[PDB]
Amino acid sequence: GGDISEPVTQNTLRVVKVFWGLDSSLAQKRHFPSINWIQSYSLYSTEVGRYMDQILQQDWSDMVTEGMRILQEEEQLNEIVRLVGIDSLSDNDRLTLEVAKSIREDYLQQNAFDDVDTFTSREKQFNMLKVILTFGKEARKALSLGAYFNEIMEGTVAVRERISRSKYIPEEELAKISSINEEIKETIQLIVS
Amino acid sequence: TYKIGVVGDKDSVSPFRLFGFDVQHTKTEIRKTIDEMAKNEYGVIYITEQCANLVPETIERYKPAIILIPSHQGTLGIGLEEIQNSVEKAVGQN
């Protein structure tokens, strides 16, 4: 029944440090691979975090942690939407959900049967997540400068569609992903004006 | 016993002073006046839609009775939009 409380799963998780819990709800929703990002864990994340930061010379661990903070906050937000409705969340929280949305379907979701999407290099992964997080960072600053939520959304239709395609950018054209960062910064600042 | 306050441009809300209303005339200054009026236990606060358009988060907090009125130039349809919106979420149809 998918119930992980049974002895084989329990005994296994007693001696292994990684749990990729597959999820039936994700599989029905065509979210592949179907790994539950709230319940899954890797006890290697902190040591890997240090290795990644060091070999990349970027604050990758803090970006992974920020991305997960957003996903975790999304789960919190979703319970509130169920109770009051999405129109009752503040502009700040509306933004968080859109950024979370982007993480889910522009990053986590990956098509095993697509020539480009089937494998993502370590460098490509860093650029993708950086872009997704930059949008949220720049939009967040716009909100604190008096800009409203949908005004930001309505004027960033083209760049958000480009973020959502970045998973299909070939490995030798990675500059096309990193340059989205500048386009984000430009258009949002222009919207503030 | 409660007092009445009025917020808007001089040309529009001036004659209200004749009845002993607190008639006052940017997002920051309008928000300050409403807050003090609320703190002083005003019964009703009348305000032009052009001033109300600048302080939507302040008004939403108190929803004194904050009453949007027109100026001599007209409304922006805010008062009737607020009514329209509340109907949609309380009843489920127009």
């Binding site: 029905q28 409705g85 | 949609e88 009843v91 489920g92 149809q93 127009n94």
Partner: protein
Amino acid sequence: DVLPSLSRLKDKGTGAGKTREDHAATMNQLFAAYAQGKQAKELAVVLGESALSDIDKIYAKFAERFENEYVNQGFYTNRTITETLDLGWELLAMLPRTELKRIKDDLLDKYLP
């Protein structure tokens, strides 16, 4: 209920020379439009009909026809694969072509009624 239903090996029995060249694309499109249609229907239940954008309203109407005319076929009624696929295109025509994002241009131009 096609939402929780699945056939895992279906790719080996569909397409050109097995069924028809438009098989995989329309399946993906019908299924994805139906899921969105039913979602819009459930949204009308929880928040009212005034909660929906038009197109949400279009998708909702889509899911109705899909259930009543496509899935519902009768227990003594046999549809050829050609009849099934043709009927699929009729339902897809309700949607704006701009919304048929799961199907490439070459197939849309050839088959869409």
